[PDB]
Symmetry: none
Subunit: 171 residues, 2 copies
Amino acid sequence: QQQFRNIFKQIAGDDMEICADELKKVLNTVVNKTHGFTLESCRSMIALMDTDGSGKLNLQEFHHLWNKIKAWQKIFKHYDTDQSGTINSYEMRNAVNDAGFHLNNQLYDIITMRYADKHMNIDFDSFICCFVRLEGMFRAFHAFDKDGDGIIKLNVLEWLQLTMYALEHHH
Amino acid sequence: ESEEQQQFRNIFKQIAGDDMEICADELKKVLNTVVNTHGFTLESCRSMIALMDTDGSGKLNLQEFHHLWNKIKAWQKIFKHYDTDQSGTINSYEMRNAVNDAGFHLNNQLYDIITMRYADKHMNIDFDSFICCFVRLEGMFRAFHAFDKDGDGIIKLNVLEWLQLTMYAL
Ligand SMILES: [Ca+2]
Ligand SMILES: [Ca+2]
Ligand SMILES: [Ca+2]
Ligand SMILES: [Ca+2]
Ligand SMILES: [Ca+2]
Ligand SMILES: [Ca+2]
Ligand SMILES: [Ca+2]
Ligand SMILES: [Ca+2]
Protein backbone atom coordinates (compact mmCIF):
# COMPACT_ATOMS: atom_id res chain seq x y z
CA GLN A 1 0.00 0.00 0.00
CA GLN A 2 2.92 2.25 -0.94
CA GLN A 3 1.38 5.66 -1.64
CA PHE A 4 -2.03 4.39 -0.65
CA ARG A 5 -0.65 4.83 2.86
CA ASN A 6 0.45 8.32 1.70
CA ILE A 7 -2.93 9.28 0.28
CA PHE A 8 -4.54 8.22 3.58
CA LYS A 9 -2.02 10.32 5.53
CA GLN A 10 -2.64 13.49 3.51
CA ILE A 11 -6.41 13.60 3.95
CA ALA A 12 -6.67 11.93 7.38
CA GLY A 13 -4.89 14.86 8.96
CA ASP A 14 -3.89 15.12 12.63
CA ASP A 15 -6.24 12.56 14.14
CA MET A 16 -5.19 9.97 11.47
CA GLU A 17 -8.78 9.08 10.77
CA ILE A 18 -11.08 10.09 8.02
CA CYS A 19 -14.37 11.87 8.61
CA ALA A 20 -17.11 12.33 6.02
CA ASP A 21 -15.64 15.53 4.59
CA GLU A 22 -12.19 14.16 4.06
CA LEU A 23 -13.71 11.07 2.39
CA LYS A 24 -15.69 13.06 -0.12
CA LYS A 25 -12.57 15.08 -0.96
CA VAL A 26 -10.35 12.04 -1.45
CA LEU A 27 -13.06 10.10 -3.29
CA ASN A 28 -13.92 12.96 -5.67
CA THR A 29 -10.24 13.72 -6.24
CA VAL A 30 -9.16 10.16 -7.08
CA VAL A 31 -12.34 8.46 -8.42
CA ASN A 32 -13.00 11.16 -11.00
CA LYS A 33 -14.30 12.93 -14.13
CA THR A 34 -23.02 15.58 -11.85
CA HIS A 35 -20.92 12.39 -11.47
CA GLY A 36 -19.48 12.95 -7.96
CA PHE A 37 -19.97 11.60 -4.46
CA THR A 38 -22.34 13.47 -2.21
CA LEU A 39 -21.82 14.01 1.51
CA GLU A 40 -24.88 11.78 1.93
CA SER A 41 -22.99 8.83 0.45
CA CYS A 42 -19.73 9.44 2.31
CA ARG A 43 -21.54 9.58 5.69
CA SER A 44 -23.18 6.24 5.07
CA MET A 45 -19.80 4.85 4.09
CA ILE A 46 -18.32 6.05 7.33
CA ALA A 47 -21.34 4.74 9.31
CA LEU A 48 -21.03 1.30 7.80
CA MET A 49 -17.30 0.73 7.48
CA ASP A 50 -16.44 2.15 10.90
CA THR A 51 -15.77 -1.18 12.50
CA ASP A 52 -14.25 -0.12 15.84
CA GLY A 53 -16.94 2.47 16.52
CA SER A 54 -14.61 5.46 16.50
CA GLY A 55 -16.88 7.46 14.24
CA LYS A 56 -14.14 7.94 11.62
CA LEU A 57 -12.20 5.63 9.29
CA ASN A 58 -8.66 4.48 10.06
CA LEU A 59 -6.29 3.07 7.43
CA GLN A 60 -7.44 -0.49 7.72
CA GLU A 61 -11.11 0.55 7.61
CA PHE A 62 -10.46 2.95 4.71
CA HIS A 63 -8.64 0.21 2.77
CA HIS A 64 -11.59 -2.15 3.05
CA LEU A 65 -13.96 0.63 2.00
CA TRP A 66 -11.69 1.18 -1.04
CA ASN A 67 -11.49 -2.41 -2.20
CA LYS A 68 -15.30 -2.37 -1.97
CA ILE A 69 -15.65 0.71 -4.14
CA LYS A 70 -13.29 -0.66 -6.79
CA ALA A 71 -15.07 -4.00 -7.04
CA TRP A 72 -18.38 -2.16 -7.28
CA GLN A 73 -16.92 0.14 -9.92
CA LYS A 74 -15.94 -2.89 -11.98
CA ILE A 75 -19.55 -3.96 -12.00
CA PHE A 76 -20.77 -0.44 -12.87
CA LYS A 77 -18.34 -0.19 -15.80
CA HIS A 78 -19.37 -3.67 -16.96
CA TYR A 79 -23.05 -2.52 -17.21
CA ASP A 80 -22.49 1.06 -18.47
CA THR A 81 -21.48 -0.21 -21.96
CA ASP A 82 -22.36 3.08 -23.66
CA GLN A 83 -20.21 5.09 -21.17
CA SER A 84 -23.33 7.06 -20.27
CA GLY A 85 -22.20 7.48 -16.61
CA THR A 86 -25.54 5.76 -15.79
CA ILE A 87 -27.15 2.34 -16.08
CA ASN A 88 -30.88 1.89 -16.62
CA SER A 89 -32.98 0.19 -13.89
CA TYR A 90 -33.02 -3.28 -15.47
CA GLU A 91 -29.25 -3.51 -15.38
CA MET A 92 -29.33 -2.63 -11.68
CA ARG A 93 -31.14 -5.88 -10.87
CA ASN A 94 -28.31 -7.65 -12.66
CA ALA A 95 -25.58 -5.53 -10.98
CA VAL A 96 -26.92 -6.19 -7.53
CA ASN A 97 -27.15 -9.92 -8.16
CA ASP A 98 -23.59 -9.98 -9.57
CA ALA A 99 -22.28 -8.28 -6.47
CA GLY A 100 -23.80 -11.12 -4.43
CA PHE A 101 -27.15 -9.70 -3.47
CA HIS A 102 -29.90 -12.13 -4.46
CA LEU A 103 -33.04 -10.28 -3.52
CA ASN A 104 -36.68 -10.29 -4.65
CA ASN A 105 -39.04 -8.19 -6.71
CA GLN A 106 -40.30 -6.02 -3.88
CA LEU A 107 -36.68 -5.09 -3.14
CA TYR A 108 -35.68 -4.47 -6.76
CA ASP A 109 -38.53 -1.95 -6.99
CA ILE A 110 -37.66 -0.26 -3.72
CA ILE A 111 -34.09 0.15 -5.07
CA THR A 112 -35.26 1.59 -8.37
CA MET A 113 -37.66 4.03 -6.64
CA ARG A 114 -35.04 5.18 -4.16
CA TYR A 115 -31.99 5.39 -6.35
CA ALA A 116 -33.02 6.02 -9.95
CA ASP A 117 -33.48 9.44 -11.49
CA LYS A 118 -36.44 10.68 -13.58
CA HIS A 119 -35.13 9.00 -16.73
CA MET A 120 -35.01 5.73 -14.70
CA ASN A 121 -31.22 5.65 -14.81
CA ILE A 122 -28.83 5.19 -11.92
CA ASP A 123 -25.65 7.20 -11.65
CA PHE A 124 -22.42 6.00 -10.05
CA ASP A 125 -22.92 7.97 -6.80
CA SER A 126 -26.43 6.48 -6.35
CA PHE A 127 -25.14 3.10 -7.41
CA ILE A 128 -22.43 3.21 -4.74
CA CYS A 129 -24.78 4.60 -2.17
CA CYS A 130 -27.21 1.71 -2.69
CA PHE A 131 -24.44 -0.94 -2.51
CA VAL A 132 -23.03 0.62 0.70
CA ARG A 133 -26.42 0.40 2.36
CA LEU A 134 -26.97 -3.24 1.19
CA GLU A 135 -23.53 -4.44 2.39
CA GLY A 136 -23.91 -2.57 5.61
CA MET A 137 -27.41 -3.95 6.23
CA PHE A 138 -26.25 -7.42 5.27
CA ARG A 139 -23.25 -7.31 7.64
CA ALA A 140 -25.31 -5.96 10.51
CA PHE A 141 -27.60 -8.95 10.06
CA HIS A 142 -24.79 -11.37 9.45
CA ALA A 143 -23.27 -10.64 12.86
CA PHE A 144 -26.31 -12.46 14.38
CA ASP A 145 -26.19 -15.24 11.72
CA LYS A 146 -22.66 -16.75 11.91
CA ASP A 147 -24.26 -20.15 11.00
CA GLY A 148 -25.12 -18.62 7.61
CA ASP A 149 -28.67 -19.92 6.92
CA GLY A 150 -30.06 -16.38 6.37
CA ILE A 151 -32.42 -16.83 9.37
CA ILE A 152 -31.94 -15.24 12.83
CA LYS A 153 -33.93 -15.34 16.06
CA LEU A 154 -33.69 -12.19 18.20
CA ASN A 155 -34.55 -11.10 21.80
CA VAL A 156 -35.50 -7.46 22.30
CA LEU A 157 -32.05 -6.12 23.15
CA GLU A 158 -30.52 -7.95 20.19
CA TRP A 159 -33.16 -6.30 17.94
CA LEU A 160 -32.38 -2.96 19.50
CA GLN A 161 -28.67 -3.56 18.84
CA LEU A 162 -29.33 -4.39 15.26
CA THR A 163 -31.73 -1.51 14.64
CA MET A 164 -29.98 1.23 16.53
CA TYR A 165 -26.87 0.34 14.61
CA ALA A 166 -28.80 0.36 11.31
CA LEU A 167 -30.39 3.82 11.84
CA GLU A 168 -27.90 6.44 10.76
CA HIS A 169 -27.78 9.82 12.48
CA HIS A 170 -26.61 12.89 10.62
CA HIS A 171 -26.68 15.88 13.03
CA GLU B 1 -53.78 21.49 29.83
CA SER B 2 -57.05 22.05 28.01
CA GLU B 3 -55.49 25.51 27.45
CA GLU B 4 -52.37 23.95 25.91
CA GLN B 5 -54.56 21.93 23.61
CA GLN B 6 -56.32 25.14 22.68
CA GLN B 7 -53.00 26.76 22.18
CA PHE B 8 -51.97 23.86 20.02
CA ARG B 9 -55.13 23.91 17.98
CA ASN B 10 -54.28 27.52 17.24
CA ILE B 11 -50.74 26.72 16.14
CA PHE B 12 -52.23 23.99 13.78
CA LYS B 13 -54.84 26.43 12.51
CA GLN B 14 -51.91 28.63 11.50
CA ILE B 15 -49.45 26.16 10.01
CA ALA B 16 -51.00 22.72 9.46
CA GLY B 17 -52.86 23.82 6.33
CA ASP B 18 -56.17 22.36 5.12
CA ASP B 19 -55.69 18.73 6.18
CA MET B 20 -55.13 19.92 9.80
CA GLU B 21 -52.26 17.42 9.93
CA ILE B 22 -48.49 18.03 10.06
CA CYS B 23 -45.83 16.45 7.87
CA ALA B 24 -42.13 16.40 8.83
CA ASP B 25 -41.38 19.83 7.27
CA GLU B 26 -44.31 21.36 9.17
CA LEU B 27 -43.32 19.73 12.47
CA LYS B 28 -39.82 21.21 12.10
CA LYS B 29 -41.41 24.64 11.72
CA VAL B 30 -43.54 24.14 14.77
CA LEU B 31 -40.91 22.84 17.19
CA ASN B 32 -38.19 25.32 16.16
CA THR B 33 -40.77 28.15 16.38
CA VAL B 34 -42.54 27.17 19.63
CA VAL B 35 -38.93 27.72 20.78
CA ASN B 36 -36.62 30.67 19.99
CA THR B 37 -28.57 27.03 15.18
CA HIS B 38 -29.48 24.23 17.59
CA GLY B 39 -33.15 23.10 17.28
CA PHE B 40 -34.65 19.97 15.71
CA THR B 41 -33.60 18.67 12.35
CA LEU B 42 -35.76 17.22 9.64
CA GLU B 43 -34.24 13.79 10.38
CA SER B 44 -35.38 13.91 13.97
CA CYS B 45 -38.91 15.12 13.02
CA ARG B 46 -39.14 12.21 10.60
CA SER B 47 -38.48 9.88 13.53
CA MET B 48 -40.91 11.69 15.77
CA ILE B 49 -43.62 11.17 13.18
CA ALA B 50 -42.74 7.47 12.78
CA LEU B 51 -43.16 7.14 16.52
CA MET B 52 -46.39 8.98 17.24
CA ASP B 53 -48.36 8.54 14.01
CA THR B 54 -50.46 5.88 15.68
CA ASP B 55 -53.19 5.99 12.96
CA GLY B 56 -50.76 5.42 10.07
CA SER B 57 -51.79 8.61 8.25
CA GLY B 58 -48.11 9.61 7.78
CA LYS B 59 -48.65 12.94 9.49
CA LEU B 60 -49.61 14.13 12.95
CA ASN B 61 -53.02 15.22 13.87
CA LEU B 62 -53.54 17.43 16.92
CA GLN B 63 -53.91 14.64 19.44
CA GLU B 64 -50.81 12.81 18.21
CA PHE B 65 -48.84 16.00 18.36
CA HIS B 66 -50.05 16.68 21.87
CA HIS B 67 -48.75 13.29 22.94
CA LEU B 68 -45.44 14.04 21.24
CA TRP B 69 -45.17 17.37 22.89
CA ASN B 70 -45.68 15.75 26.26
CA LYS B 71 -42.97 13.21 25.75
CA ILE B 72 -40.56 15.92 24.62
CA LYS B 73 -41.43 17.77 27.80
CA ALA B 74 -40.76 14.71 29.95
CA TRP B 75 -37.47 13.93 28.20
CA GLN B 76 -36.43 17.54 28.34
CA LYS B 77 -36.83 17.43 32.13
CA ILE B 78 -34.41 14.47 32.17
CA PHE B 79 -32.00 16.32 29.91
CA LYS B 80 -32.02 19.38 32.28
CA HIS B 81 -31.28 17.22 35.31
CA TYR B 82 -27.94 16.24 33.75
CA ASP B 83 -26.84 19.36 31.81
CA THR B 84 -25.89 21.04 35.11
CA ASP B 85 -23.33 23.36 33.50
CA GLN B 86 -26.10 24.73 31.22
CA SER B 87 -23.88 23.67 28.28
CA GLY B 88 -26.70 22.49 25.94
CA THR B 89 -25.16 19.03 26.00
CA ILE B 90 -24.71 16.02 28.30
CA ASN B 91 -21.83 13.56 28.37
CA SER B 92 -21.89 9.84 27.85
CA TYR B 93 -22.17 8.61 31.40
CA GLU B 94 -24.94 11.14 31.89
CA MET B 95 -26.77 9.55 28.88
CA ARG B 96 -26.80 6.07 30.53
CA ASN B 97 -28.57 7.45 33.53
CA ALA B 98 -30.85 9.62 31.41
CA VAL B 99 -31.70 6.54 29.38
CA ASN B 100 -32.42 4.53 32.52
CA ASP B 101 -34.32 7.44 34.05
CA ALA B 102 -36.52 7.52 30.93
CA GLY B 103 -37.40 3.84 31.55
CA PHE B 104 -35.18 2.05 28.98
CA HIS B 105 -33.15 -0.95 30.12
CA LEU B 106 -30.41 -1.66 27.67
CA ASN B 107 -26.92 -3.10 27.77
CA ASN B 108 -23.29 -1.99 27.34
CA GLN B 109 -23.29 -2.61 23.60
CA LEU B 110 -26.32 -0.41 23.20
CA TYR B 111 -24.56 2.37 25.19
CA ASP B 112 -21.61 2.13 22.78
CA ILE B 113 -23.88 2.26 19.77
CA ILE B 114 -25.80 5.24 21.12
CA THR B 115 -22.47 6.99 21.68
CA MET B 116 -21.13 6.13 18.21
CA ARG B 117 -24.34 7.53 16.60
CA TYR B 118 -25.51 10.42 18.79
CA ALA B 119 -22.43 11.90 20.46
CA ASP B 120 -20.19 14.59 18.97
CA LYS B 121 -16.41 14.36 18.73
CA HIS B 122 -16.22 15.45 22.41
CA MET B 123 -18.59 12.58 23.37
CA ASN B 124 -21.44 14.90 24.24
CA ILE B 125 -25.11 14.66 23.23
CA ASP B 126 -26.92 17.82 22.14
CA PHE B 127 -30.66 17.97 22.58
CA ASP B 128 -31.66 17.20 18.97
CA SER B 129 -29.68 13.92 19.09
CA PHE B 130 -30.90 13.15 22.61
CA ILE B 131 -34.53 13.32 21.57
CA CYS B 132 -33.88 11.64 18.24
CA CYS B 133 -32.26 8.71 20.03
CA PHE B 134 -35.08 8.43 22.50
CA VAL B 135 -37.85 8.27 19.91
CA ARG B 136 -35.99 5.62 17.90
CA LEU B 137 -35.41 3.63 21.01
CA GLU B 138 -39.15 3.79 21.82
CA GLY B 139 -40.08 3.16 18.19
CA MET B 140 -37.88 0.09 18.06
CA PHE B 141 -39.30 -1.31 21.29
CA ARG B 142 -42.78 -0.83 19.78
CA ALA B 143 -41.72 -2.63 16.56
CA PHE B 144 -40.41 -5.54 18.48
CA HIS B 145 -43.55 -6.18 20.52
CA ALA B 146 -45.73 -5.66 17.43
CA PHE B 147 -43.70 -8.28 15.50
CA ASP B 148 -43.81 -10.71 18.44
CA LYS B 149 -47.37 -11.97 17.86
CA ASP B 150 -47.11 -15.01 20.09
CA GLY B 151 -45.53 -12.90 22.91
CA ASP B 152 -42.68 -15.29 23.67
CA GLY B 153 -40.10 -12.49 23.56
CA ILE B 154 -38.49 -13.71 20.33
CA ILE B 155 -38.85 -12.73 16.64
CA LYS B 156 -37.78 -14.57 13.48
CA LEU B 157 -36.31 -12.63 10.60
CA ASN B 158 -34.77 -13.65 7.31
CA VAL B 159 -32.22 -11.44 5.50
CA LEU B 160 -34.69 -10.26 2.86
CA GLU B 161 -37.32 -9.32 5.44
CA TRP B 162 -34.52 -7.41 7.11
CA LEU B 163 -33.32 -5.71 3.92
CA GLN B 164 -36.98 -4.86 3.24
CA LEU B 165 -37.42 -3.11 6.56
CA THR B 166 -34.19 -1.16 6.37
CA MET B 167 -35.00 0.33 2.95
CA TYR B 168 -38.25 2.03 4.00
CA ALA B 169 -39.12 1.71 7.72
CA LEU B 170 -35.52 2.56 8.81
CA1 LIG C 1 -9.25 13.56 10.01
CA1 LIG D 1 -13.03 3.68 13.01
CA1 LIG E 1 -25.60 3.29 -19.79
CA1 LIG F 1 -29.09 -18.47 11.33
CA1 LIG G 1 -50.44 19.90 6.53
CA1 LIG H 1 -51.65 10.39 12.18
CA1 LIG I 1 -23.09 19.65 30.06
CA1 LIG J 1 -42.34 -14.63 19.02
